[PDB]
Structure formats: structure tokens, C-alpha cells
Amino acid sequence: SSRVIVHVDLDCFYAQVEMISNPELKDKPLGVQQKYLVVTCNYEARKLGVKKLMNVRDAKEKCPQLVLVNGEDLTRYREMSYKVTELLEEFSPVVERLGFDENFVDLTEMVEKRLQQLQSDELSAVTVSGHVYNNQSINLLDVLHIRLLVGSQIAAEMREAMYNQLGLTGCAGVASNKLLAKLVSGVFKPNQQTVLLPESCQHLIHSLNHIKEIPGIGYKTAKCLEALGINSVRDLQTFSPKILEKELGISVAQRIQKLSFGEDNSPVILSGPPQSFSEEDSFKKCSSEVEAKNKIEELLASLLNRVCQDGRKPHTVRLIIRRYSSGRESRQCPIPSHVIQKDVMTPMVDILMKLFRNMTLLSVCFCNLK
DNA sequence: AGGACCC
DNA sequence: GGGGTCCT
Ligand SMILES: Nc1ccn([C@H]2C[C@H](O)[C@@H](COP(=O)(O)OP(=O)(O)OP(=O)(O)O)O2)c(=O)n1
Numbered sequence: 001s002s003r004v005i006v007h008v009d010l011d012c013f014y015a016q017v018e019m020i021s022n023p024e025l026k027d028k029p030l031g032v033q034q035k036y037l038v039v040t041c042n043y044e045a046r047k048l049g050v051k052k053l054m055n056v057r058d059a060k061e062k063c064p065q066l067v068l069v070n071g072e073d074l075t076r077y078r079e080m081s082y083k084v085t086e087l088l089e090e091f092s093p094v095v096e097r098l099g100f101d102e103n104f105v106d107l108t109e110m111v112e113k114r115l116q117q118l119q120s121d122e123l124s125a126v127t128v129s130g131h132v133y134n135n136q137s138i139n140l141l142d143v144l145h146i147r148l149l150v151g152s153q154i155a156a157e158m159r160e161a162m163y164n165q166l167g168l169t170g171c172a173g174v175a176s177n178k179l180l181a182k183l184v185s186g187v188f189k190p191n192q193q194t195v196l197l198p199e200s201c202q203h204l205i206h207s208l209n210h211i212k213e214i215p216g217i218g219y220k221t222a223k224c225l226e227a228l229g230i231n232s233v234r235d236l237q238t239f240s241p242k243i244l245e246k247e248l249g250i251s252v253a254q255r256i257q258k259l260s261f262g263e264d265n266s267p268v269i270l271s272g273p274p275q276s277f278s279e280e281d282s283f284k285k286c287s288s289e290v291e292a293k294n295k296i297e298e299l300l301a302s303l304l305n306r307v308c309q310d311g312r313k314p315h316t317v318r319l320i321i322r323r324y325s326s327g328r329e330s331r332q333c334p335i336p337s338h339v340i341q342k343d344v345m346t347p348m349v350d351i352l353m354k355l356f357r358n359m360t361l362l363s364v365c366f367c368n369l370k
Numbered sequence: 371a372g373g374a375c376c377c
Numbered sequence: 378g379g380g381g382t383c384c385t
Contacts, residue, residue: 034378099377218375280379
């Protein structure tokens with residue numbers, strides 16, 4: 001039972017959406033701004049030495065033409081993000097979202113259904129769509145090559161559809177599991193696709209220049225390995241299981257070792273509707289702590305609209321803060337049943353304010369949706 | 371409640 | 378930055 005998975009990854013996503021809004025920005029170098037941050041930027045702008053999450057500070061000093069648009073309000077990028085997922089759901093119901101711009105679809109049932117349709121003869125006419133990782137030779141007599149190519153044909157269709165139907169371009173990687181599809185999708189960008197045949201899996205895995213570059217291994221695990229002599233993928237592949245267990249837990253240990261081989265048994269999960277809704281707001285200090293209520297009235301008013309759009313009702317509220325640094329904090333509590341009726345801000349602002357007193361950034365999160 | 375991870 | 382997810 002070997003799977004066929006596609007990882008769909010949108011190009012420079014926010015800049016795409018802005019570029020659609022204001023076409024006078026197309027092929028003008030564009031960065032998207034949130035506070036002091038240039039969060040993403042278009043390819044026209046990348047060429048000129050802009051990188052994602054560069055300071056607006058430097059970024060201008062590296063490009064003094066860079067046209068900046070404010071993207072602190074995610075309403076539109078969120079909305080467009082869902083249209084993408086929904087389009088892919090039309091291909092196979094089982095789409096998993098990674099952030100606003102990444103999607104996995106498990107294509108296994110679909111490829112098999114396609115193959116069932118073809119005869120002995122047109123099975124030799126099965127060709128690839130896009131790049132093949134590491135220029136690897138197709139062997140049409142290989143059942144796993146055949147499926148991976150049909151997989152790639154499906155990916156090209158998702159991509160044609162996203163562009164035709166939503167005006168959006170992006171990348172795809174096709175592979176036998178989520179880790180690999182995610183790694184191969186980025187090999188040719190922008191707006192290209194790559195299929196990974198199994199013989200080229202070590203090659204892919206070994207092209208990484210650091211364990212941190214593995215989806216799964218984050219800021220902290222990196223530092224944990226780096227502090228053990230482990231730096232390459234092979235270092236990880238060959239480190240002692242037993243010792244690695246003792247340091248990070250049999251839980252993290254045993255999975256990140258699989259990962260270092262290219263092995264990933266984790267299923268594509270159907271995302272469906274969101275588990276939560278939140279608004280954030282960052283600032284340089286707010287200690288007036290009644291103005292700190294106003295912030296909380298803004299976050300609420302907006303959040304309230306979003307749940308009012310959904311039609312599902314949240315049963316828990318959360319307030320999150322951070323104290324001037326020199327870690328975030330949260331207080332939860334249920335939403336009272338009498339006030340789960342969609343007047344409503346008037347009672348909510350108190351719940352949050354006593355939650356407030358029980359304690360740079362203010363944040364409200366609604367969760368436990370029914 | 372706070373942590374690790376993702377974008 | 379401004380969002381999300383699942384686990385402990
Ligand atoms: N660490 C991150 C990663 C992403 N984002 C935001 C900015 C992006 O518009 C979007 C997704 O980021 P990606 O890393 O997938 O990069 P893009 O899709 O924006 O550009 P590209 O795929 O060409 O690198 O969410 C962010 O704020 N902080």
C-alpha cells in the first residue's frame with residue numbers, strides 16, 4: 001500500500017493577492033508589510049535582493065523603489081486561501097492545510113481510479129507532466145513510476161484550475177508521502193512542478209544542508225541536535241537511536257529519525273472548517289491598560305463578524321498577552337451559554353477584562369467550536 | 371496553561 | 378508579523 005500525495009504551495013501568496021487587487025503593482029517590485037516587517041514580496045522584488053521577513057528598515061535600503069502594501073489584516077488572504085482548498089477538495093475530499101498557502105492532497109484513490117480506466121496499450125503512452133526530480137529515468141514497467149506520473153498529471157490539473165478559476169499560480173511536488181512531497185515541490189519555483197521517483201529519495205534527502213531544513217525539526221529541536229554534534233541529515237540518520245531517545249524522548253526521537261531517511265507514515269488529514277479564530281495586534285508598549293481595553297474592543301468587533309459568517313458557535317474564549325521582554329500568556333474560560341447567541345460585545349468585554357486582570361501584544365481567540 | 375511545530 | 382495545528 002504505497003500512496004501518491006501532492007503538496008500544493010502557492011507562490012509569494014500575499015503579494016499575489018495584492019497584485020490581483022491592484023494590477024498596477026504587477027511587474028512592479030512588491031513587498032507586503034506588517035509592522036516593521038516585510039513579510040513576503042513578489043519575484044520582481046526578490047531578484048533585487050529582497051528576502052522574506054526582511055526588515056522594512058533594510059529592505060528599502062536594498063531597494064529604494066520597492067512598493068509596499070500593508071498586510072496586517074488577513075481577511076482577503078484568508079478568504080482566497082479557502083477558495084484554493086475548496087478547489088482542491090473538488091479533486092479529492094481529503095485535503096490538509098499547512099498555513100494559508102500550503103495544501104496536501106492524498107491522490108492515492110484517484111490515481112488508481114484513473115489507471116483502472118486505461119487499456120494495456122495507452123498505458124505505455126503515460127507521460128510525465130513537469131520536472132522529474134534529479135532527471136531520473138522513467139521506467140514505464142514500474143508500477144510506482146506509472147502512479148507517480150498519473151499523480152503529476154493530476155497536479156498539473158489542479159495548477160491549471162487554480163490559475164484559470166482563481167487567477168493564482170503556484171508549485172506542486174508529487175511523491176509517496178507528505179515529507180517528500182513538501183521537499184520536492186520547492187525544487188523548481190516559481191510556478192513549476194516536480195515529481196519524485198523512489199530511486200531519488202536519498203538524493204533529495206541528502207540535498208538538505210541542515211536538519212533544521214526538515215519539516216518537523218523546528219527552532220528548538222535543531223538546537224538540541226546541534227548541541228550533540230548532529231548537523232547533516234546523515235549525522236541524524238547515523239546517530240545512535242538509543243541516545244537520541246534519552247535526550248528528546250522516544251516520541252520525537254523515533255520520528256525525526258524516520259524523517260531523516262525520507263520516511264513519513266503520517267496520513268493527510270482532512271482540515272475541514274477551522275478549529276479556532278483569532279485576531280492579533282502587536283505594539284511597542286501599551287500600559288494605559290484601559291486603552292488596553294480598546295484594543296480588546298477592536299479585536300472583538302472583528303472576530304465577532306467572522307464567527308457570525310461561519311454559523312458554528314464557539315464555547316470557549318481566550319485572552320493572550322506578552323510582557324515587555326528582557327513568552328506569551330493566556331487565560332481561558334467558557335463562553336456563558338446565555339451569551340452564545342450569535343448586545344454580545346457588551347457582555348464579552350467584561351469576561352475578557354477580568355481575564356485581563358488575572359495577569360507588547362494583545363490577542364483574543366475563540367475556540368471549542370460546536 | 372503552556373509547549374512544540376507549521377506557514 | 379499574524380495567523381494556524383496538535384500534544385503535554
Ligand atoms: N514564517 C512565516 C511564513 C509565512 N508568513 C506569511 C507570509 C506569506 O505571504 C505566507 C506564506 O509564506 P511561505 O513561506 O509559504 O512563502 P510565500 O508563499 O509567501 O513565497 P514563496 O513560496 O515563493 O517563497 O504567510 C509569515 O508571516 N511568516
